[PDB]
């Protein structure tokens, strides 16, 4: 693992998206992690369908706009044998019936991995595998109103994490490079430098995973 990683400079990452008012952060988180692992194996970056996850991942456990888990999404992809592109299956910030069509699938996986709960373990996964799906405690107006700098909230938890995002790299005092799903208008062009190697700040390590590809 090096001193800094930016997986964006290497093709693994698509633009920042906006979840609307739907509470789907787990679909975005999970399509981003699948995005860069699909890039890894195939060398083509393709936008994936967050709506497909929202309408269809119920059987695995996700409650659409009421909530979900990244882990359950990858597990949908596995069980169902695919995900659709965003071309074919566009995002409507709304829960509806499943309109999956294999004739338009472009990603798949054989399950997921749960990274041990350590920041040293998180660093190394990011360093070797790609961007990783994580879950942090956004539950503060501080995070909501973040514009720029090394985000560090004095009263942030390490145990409960309410919001699933994407670690696309890290840098250097030191920071995790985090892609959110609240549009490019939020924070730093949609990204937020989260504090790194500080008693598991905002639980970023606590629940990191990625799709087996
Ligand atoms: C986003 N706008 C709304 N947030 C959620 O839906 C969160 C995201 C989240 C938080 C904490 C962990 C995870 C996650 N994903 N994989 C893993 C474990 N390796 O952890 C995702 N969702 C929840 O808080 C949530 C959803 C549920 C279900 C669907 C099981 C009821 N339970 N929780 C706690």
UniProtKB/Swiss-Prot annotation:
Residues binding Zn(2+) 1, per UniProt: 9
Residues that hold Zn(2+) 3 according to the record: 71, 114
Residue window of the full protein shown: 114 to 333 of 333
Binding of Zn(2+) 6, residues: 160
Domain of life assignment: Eukaryota
Organism for this UniProt entry: Homo sapiens
Active site (UniProt): 25, 163, 180
Protein name: Cathepsin L
Chain sites annotated for binding Zn(2+) 4: 92, 96
Disulfide-bond pairs as recorded: 22-65, 56-98, 156-202
Glycosylation sites: 108
Residues that bind Zn(2+) 2: 50, 86
